[PDB]
Design a protein around this ligand. Structure first.
Ligand SMILES: CCc1cccc(S(=O)(=O)NC(=O)Nc2ncc(Br)s2)c1
Ligand SMILES: CCc1cccc(S(=O)(=O)NC(=O)Nc2ncc(Br)s2)c1
Ligand SMILES: CCc1cccc(S(=O)(=O)NC(=O)Nc2ncc(Br)s2)c1
Ligand SMILES: CCc1cccc(S(=O)(=O)NC(=O)Nc2ncc(Br)s2)c1
Lengths: 317, 317, 319, 317
């Protein structure tokens, strides 16, 4: 039987007997994602080039506007905005949403994969809505995931029931369920980081990477892939297994990737898929944030791969 | 003035006062790319998952069939076919076309960019058409390029007049000229190869890459990117500068990429762009082929970077 | 604020503290409407014509709607123009609603790209017995919801409920129905009558006189204009938009008219009524007829109440 | 073999040994139509309605700009413009085009089919183009036809070789040849006119209409279809056969429809399809015009039906 994003969400929302507010949030977000995908694929570009004689900003406005008018949100955190956005009182709801509306978009000149990443929280405090409401650890997420604008557009959604993958059929504008309750492989064959920072790598990374190229047990060396767009790298890791790394470096000593709307949502998908995400020091999901734009170092992927990296981080204290 | 691939090619064609064949060819191919692109983006997928109750094969068929029926070709060589296809007599025209109908289709599962790569020759003799008509050095190319099915669909076309980029507007099914006469940067800041296979690297490759990561002077190291899909990696090299390698090693003395429909069309675009393309021993475009599926090594991109590769290469020769 | 069909239905769903079954059902129907539009616009026809070198459109339309409603878990009995009997949803997929629909009306004329459409009527199951065809034999008055999709120059979903009639435009770029006209109301009096005058020899005497009065008025005002697309959905939607009258009346040869009561007449009557207009057979309200055959026919006269009433003045004058 | 509008026009142009000018023109036109189709089907309408926080005027803009930039035209006559447009001298070409860019537009509220009507002339001489170049009888058309934005989008193209019908496939944005060398039925069974104005009819119209409803020879009454949108009624008359009328009453002695860009193209399609078009007094194509915006009565469709009307019109003297 055929399933869609909306029908999936309505069905699962009826099992748990909720008010429907998360369903409205998510419906709204799906719609924003379809409009982003449409713009990303360059629909209507002829009109820009005179046939009748900014993208990250548009995607931001799209997510924001849809999320506000879903009536389901109170605090909104975006990659694009300096401060948390506080929903006007009349449109206030119970969820806090952190998001990057178009990740990878600095590199989009070369039509690299891009995507949208989100995490949704139930507002915890009873105080007036503020920036602090977004500062919960990722263990708390109610729902998270991403859309990938690749060769095709795919929505990956993780909740309590696991991870589910919806392909956007552009002919009808519907997300179609194509991969149910997805589990990552226990062990992969591909490793992912920007090796151009090799000079700055601390010795645990350097040893770990060295083991992938020169396995110490005469197994086959891991292949390397780095699109350098977060959504594409994590998704491949999800689909094929392996390991994704963005550790700290001299230019980025607290990591480079953001915790709230990059590392947390991706960590959440990984764990729900049966995988791992770590900073090296702890799980990413357990990091208790202090600033909405703070960075985090991240290693994530197949459990045997992240474990084997943690042993090496262990070897170096 | 708004320009399209069609209007563009008709403009150039009339200037040259040619018969029109090449124009008919390009238009045919173009129509194939839109069809490929629509399927890559998964139009109609709802029907597959049972709403009302292969991609490599499809793309090959679209290209094959559209070329045959352009009345402009006589020998067609494809990644997908063992032998060269000889167009039926009443459909024969003057050109030979070497193509990869969907490059990177191997990894489409992770929705990594895929592409179509093409190379167009004029048949040289009045002989009965055979595989041998495709065995031309890349220098004899009349036109070449690729379609990238990435975050948007773009068609890069190289001819004598240089290299032009058209973005497909999906609203109206036209490729729109968006980048005129593109030239690659003299010197890039990015290197691109599978570093997972370092233990089998050629020692020249070993050393060159080490200088990118560990520069002896006081320069900033190169950033690393490797999509693992040629059209994407070559296209990012074009737009931002840098170097892409798929080189020889002792296990694979002649590399892995196919000369006819991968390396030559890429070498062609890069040279028209004012970039370089080499096997280490010689320019990619000067290799005389003896087998339609023969492999070539390729190092390509910004001229300063390729020249620097060659310097190290020679240090090891 | 931007409103879409899915946000609209959920927002009304919540207000009413419902289970969401009707919401799931409409979503499913709307998904089906989007897949019919795509097919109707001929997306993918190049393949049909050997570009790399099957199903007919009303058939496809039928399978799309059937399948979308079945799998919505909100239906128990389905009645479609295409099938002789009612479909009884398999137990594991049973819900509380009965749906009558014409999946692709006017498709007999798809060869000339005339506007086509999907008409639907939604009913609550009234008995406690195992579901059956009888559950579809409800008067129009019992409708929970009705409407249509018009596949014209653009695709629109006109949805009628207790709260009124809402019109949603399909944005093909994103696959979303956008609310473009809220709480829509027909004019009190139009300037357009609509029927097939080519069959004038066969008109009811009442129909002959009324049409004659619209062409040559005794009060000598301006005559009405004529429009007849030949597609119900298109003719009925124009009527709703520009006001006037649409007639597919009875005659000696066809004394119960020709259009089907359950999935053409009733739903167009309900939309008309929720929009402050009128639908009649001459003898009764379309919505009041108690059906006895799911494929039964009714005569239908609808539109501006000043126009319809005016037809009844003539109708009653001919008894 | 599959055929497209571009491919078909190219091969007919090559046949005729022409210079490519009319092909360039038709492609610019075809492109504009795709852009008109797209906006008429309401792509982007969510953006108008505030998702991120005219149509006849736009359509005219698209045809206008696409024809200017085609360099194939010199005089443009549009329904939307009081005086003819003279193309600026660098874009000047040898053709004159009269068009209705969006027929039926003032009734687009009820989403009635709309269309674009066009007909194309050779310029009259080197004499710096003027409004005069448009004042030519229908017989001088080189090509004509319409695009109908119906349940799907169809382009109908009439030329010396006959009438061919192309279906716009929105997935790939390409016009597919679906009906070759179309001929109208000798006699149909449908008549088409605003019967609402029966009061004002010519006795000949009245009598002819009388014969349709009440055959004196016993036969079946004709059906009546009237959409109120010229392209849709004319297209129904082409596909199914029958008769379309918009004739002269003593109030509109020369009809209502316009000659240059409504009656002529449709009459030229009709004659090329083996049917007829008349004012009653003469053929439509034979009228010599003296104003770009003058009207003309028109009766067109299947020959047997048109001859029937005439036979009656001649009875009424
Ligand atoms: C899958 C998302 C999800 C999962 C669990 C709960 C909820 S919820 O938003 O809190 N309640 C909800 O959707 N109730 C509904 N009743 C009827 C319909 Br139709 S939807 C959402
Ligand atoms: C840029 C494509 C190109 C470049 C060089 C030559 C040719 S050609 O195909 O050999 N000649 C050609 O197309 N002539 C034309 N005549 C009329 C039209 Br409209 S186009 C094409
Ligand atoms: C607008 C149609 C409509 C009107 C009234 C009632 C219903 S209903 O289907 O019976 N209830 C319903 O949807 N409740 C909901 N709870 C949560 C969400 Br999200 S929706 C539908
Ligand atoms: C089919 C329209 C038509 C019919 C007859 C003549 C012409 S034309 O415009 O004068 N010449 C033309 O198209 N020449 C071409 N040469 C090569 C190509 Br590729 S196209 C057009």
């Amino acid at each position: 039987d055929v399933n869609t994003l909306t029908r999936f969400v309505m069905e699962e929302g009826r099992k748990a007997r909720g008010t429907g507010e998360l369903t409205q949030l998510l419906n709204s977000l799906c719609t924003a994602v379809k409009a982003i995908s449409s713009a990303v694929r360059k629909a209507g570009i002829a009109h820009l080039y005179g046939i009748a004689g900014k993208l990250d900003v548009l995607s931001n406005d799209l997510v924001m506007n849809m999320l506000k008018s879903s009536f389901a949100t109170c605090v909104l955190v975006s990659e694009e905005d300096k401060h948390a956005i506080i929903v006007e009182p009349e449109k206030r709801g119970k969820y806090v949403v952190c998001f990057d509306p178009l990740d990878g978009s600095s590199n989009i000149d070369c039509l690299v994969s891009v995507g949208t990443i989100f995490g949704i929280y139930r507002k915890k405090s009873t105080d007036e809505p503020s920036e602090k409401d977004a500062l919960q650890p990722g263990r708390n997420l109610v729902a998270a995931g991403y859309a990938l604008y690749g060769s095709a557009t795919m929505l990956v959604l993780a909740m309590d029931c696991g991870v589910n993958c919806f392909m956007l059929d552009p002919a009808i504008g519907e997300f179609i369920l194509v991969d149910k309750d997805v589990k990552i492989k226990k062990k992969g064959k591909i490793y992912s980081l920007n090796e151009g920072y090799a000079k700055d790598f601390d010795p645990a990374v350097t040893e770990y990477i060295q083991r992938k190229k020169f396995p110490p047990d005469n197994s086959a060396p891991y292949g390397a892939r780095y699109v350098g767009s977060m959504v594409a790298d994590v998704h491949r890791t999800l689909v094929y297994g392996g390991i994704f790394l963005y550790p700290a470096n001299k230019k980025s000593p607290n990591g480079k990737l953001r915790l709230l709307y990059e590392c947390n949502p991706m960590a959440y998908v990984m764990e729900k898929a049966g995988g791992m995400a770590t900073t090296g020091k702890e799980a990413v999901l357990d990091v208790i944030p202090t600033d909405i734009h703070q960075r985090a170092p991240v290693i994530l992927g197949s459990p045997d791969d992240v474990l084997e990296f943690l042993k090496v981080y262990e070897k170096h204290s």
